[PDB]
Amino acid sequence: MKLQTTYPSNNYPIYVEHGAIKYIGTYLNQFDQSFLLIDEYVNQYFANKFDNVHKVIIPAGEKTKTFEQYQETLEYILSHHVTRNTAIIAVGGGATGDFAGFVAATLLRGVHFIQVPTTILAHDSSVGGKVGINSKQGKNLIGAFYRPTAVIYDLDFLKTLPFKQILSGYAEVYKHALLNGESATQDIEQHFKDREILQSLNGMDKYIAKGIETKLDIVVADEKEQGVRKFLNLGHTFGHAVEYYHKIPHGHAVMVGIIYQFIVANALFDSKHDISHYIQYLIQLGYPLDGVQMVLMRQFGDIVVQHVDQLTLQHACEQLKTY
Ligand SMILES: NC(=O)c1ccc[n+]([C@@H]2O[C@H](COP(=O)([O-])OP(=O)(O)OC[C@H]3O[C@@H](n4cnc5c(N)ncnc54)[C@H](O)[C@@H]3O)[C@@H](O)[C@H]2O)c1
Ligand SMILES: [Zn+2]
């Protein structure tokens, strides 16, 4: 399946399929040089699937998204007397994509950029143009909006994901379903009903694709997060925090924030959200359970963005600790 952005100009394809890795060669030709920036671990796993093109091994996961690693990689690459017709190919998860993407965005004011996502959670991150690094202050505080030349998503990369990464990635697949509606949420809940099915990845393809289409509507609609793209931050308000203190996986935190979010909506609008229902769903999936802006779902199809006071968040956290 090939998806494609529909902006008034400068659009990119999104190849989602088992074996899409092939499509990378078709591009590589039209580039002077190509820098294969690949994750430390990811390189171990697929160094062979890849062996004018240079491989740059960067730290694992979030370890590379530092301002320091940003200077070193740009410098190292710059030393290779590059040109504006150079491409940065990002092989790895969301962390490498963001980092490599920020290098590609700032190198010579912007060079060519190929996204090669290898995680479930990367179905979300490789789409939309958000790239960047973290700051000693907080998460993705420094970055840019920069459209890749193409997104090449090969589903076979997913076969080697520990369950920990499956769970983490699922949170985003599930967030999109939530944002996509009540019918898509009950649809995905019934399929991925337990840890076993989830861990097997059976049918994740369809849901991943569905997830990309959902976001592809929102980001083409509101590219710079000036309107509806803020709905994508569902459960990231409380998620982004929890993550930075307990350093759990990104997706694990989102789920906790998605629960939290439901609790808050119940306080304000009294949505009558079966919190007990969502909690049990996380338990069945195998999730280890151990005015501030905010994207709140008042009802499926009625997503809102508004401030919330400490007292409401204080009470929303009280309720959550119940579980
Ligand atoms: N719009 C956006 O740009 C956006 C949206 C969502 C999340 N994010 C960012 O993305 C990151 C989270 O995504 P992530 O989970 O992919 O991060 P990640 O890069 O850290 O990948 C998770 C782990 O999986 C390993 N891994 C990668 N591919 C693998 C594979 N096929 N087999 C086995 N192990 C593999 C990595 O080495 C890493 O240890 C965060 O840094 C977050 O801030 C950005
Ligand atoms: Zn996210």
DSSP of 282-320: HHHHT-----B--EEEEETTEEEE--B-HHHHHHHHHHH
Residue 213 · residue 179 · CB < 8 Å: no
286 is in an annotated binding site: no
Residue 96 · residue 75 · CB < 8 Å: no
- Dihedral (Cα; 102, 295, 320, 195), 10-degree rounding: -60
Residue 97 · residue 120 · CB < 8 Å: no
Angle at 68 between CA 64 and CA 71, to 5 degrees: 100
Neighbours of 319 (CB within 10 A): 16
Substitution site in 125, 199, 222, 240 for ligand 1 pocket (most atoms within 8 Å of beta carbon): 125
**92's torsion region: left (phi>0), alpha (psi -120 to 50) or beta?**
left
The DSSP bridge partners found for residue 130 are 145
Question: Of the listed 109, 136, 272, 321, which one is catalytic?
Answer: 109
- Dihedral (Cα; 226, 227, 233, 234), 10-degree rounding: 170
Sign of CA dihedral 251, 253, 258, 259: positive
- The ligand placed nearest to the CA atom of residue 163 is 1
The encoded tokens of residue 159 equal 């076969």
Residue 28: closest CA among 113, 103, 107: 113
64 is in an annotated binding site: yes
Strands 302-305 and 295-299: antiparallel
Residue 71 · residue 95 · CB < 8 Å: no
Strands 87-92 and 112-117: parallel
Question: Hey, what amino acid is at 305?
Answer: V
Spatial separation of the C-alpha atoms in residues 31 and 84, rounded to whole Å: 9
Fold of 161-323: Dehydroquinate synthase-like, alpha domain (1.20.1090)
Ligand 1 pocket, residues with Cβ under 6 angstroms: 39, 41-42, 45, 60-62, 92-96, 98, 118-119, 121-122, 124-125, 128, 130, 139-140, 157, 160-161, 165, 168, 250
CATH number of 1-160: 3.40.50.1970
Residue 43, C-beta contacts closer than 8 angstroms, at least 6 positions apart: 55, 57, 91
Residue 128 · residue 219 · CB < 8 Å: yes
Length of the chain: 323
Mutual angle of helices 163-180 and 182-191, in 10-degree steps: 150
The encoded tokens of residue 207 equal 């849901």
- 250 belongs to the catalytic site: yes
Residue 320 has phi, psi (to 5 degrees) of: -65, -40
Residue 151: closest CA among 212, 233, 222, 223: 212
3-state helix, strand, coil in the chain (%, to 5): 55, 15, 30
User: Solved by what technique?
Assistant: X-ray
Neighbours of 269 (CB within 10 A): 15
**10's torsion region: left (phi>0), alpha (psi -120 to 50) or beta?**
left
Residue 219: closest CA among 231, 210, 208: 231
From the number of C-beta atoms within 10 Å of its C-beta (0-12, 13-18, 19+), residue 253 rates as: buried
Spatial separation of the C-alpha atoms in residues 42 and 84, rounded to whole Å: 27
The encoded tokens of residue 323 equal 């579980």
DSSP SS3 for 187 = helix
**For the chain, domain boundaries:** 1-160, 161-323
Residue 112 · residue 31 · CB < 8 Å: yes
Spatial separation of the C-alpha atoms in residues 212 and 214, rounded to whole Å: 5
Residue 125 · residue 215 · CB < 8 Å: no
- 215 belongs to the catalytic site: yes
Residue 188: closest CA among 168, 161, 159, 209: 209
DSSP SS3 for 81 = coil
Residue 123 · residue 157 · CB < 8 Å: no
Neighbours of 122 (CB within 10 A): 26
Residue 257, C-beta contacts closer than 8 angstroms, at least 6 positions apart: 235, 236, 237, 238, 239, 240, 241, 242
Residue 251 · residue 121 · CB < 8 Å: yes
Spatial separation of the C-alpha atoms in residues 294 and 278, rounded to whole Å: 19
99 is in an annotated binding site: no
HSE at residue 29, side-chain half, CA atoms within 13 A, is 5
Question: Hey, what amino acid is at 297?
Answer: M
Residue 143 · residue 103 · CB < 8 Å: no
The encoded tokens of residue 119 equal 């995680």
DSSP classification of residue 177: H
The encoded tokens of residue 200 equal 């097997």
Residue 177 · residue 188 · CB < 8 Å: yes
HSE at residue 187, side-chain half, CA atoms within 13 A, is 16
Question: Of the listed 17, 189, 223, 225, which one is catalytic?
Answer: 225
97 is in an annotated binding site: yes
Question: Of the listed 123, 175, 229, 230, which one is catalytic?
Answer: 229
Resolution value, angstrom units? 2.2
Question: How far does residue 247's CA lie from ligand 1's centre (Å)?
Answer: 14
Q: Where are the beta strands (DSSP E) in the chain?
A: 2-4, 13-17, 34-39, 53-58, 87-92, 112-117, 130-133, 142-145, 150-154, 295-299, 302-305
Substitution site in 113, 119, 126, 157 for ligand 1 pocket (most atoms within 8 Å of beta carbon): 119
Residue 67 · residue 46 · CB < 8 Å: no
Whose CA is closest to atom 9 on ligand 1?
94
Please list every residue in the chain followed by a chain break, i.e. its C lies more than 2.5 Å from the next written N.
51, 290
Residue 86: closest CA among 113, 58, 63: 113
From the number of C-beta atoms within 10 Å of its C-beta (0-12, 13-18, 19+), residue 74 rates as: middle
**38's torsion region: left (phi>0), alpha (psi -120 to 50) or beta?**
beta
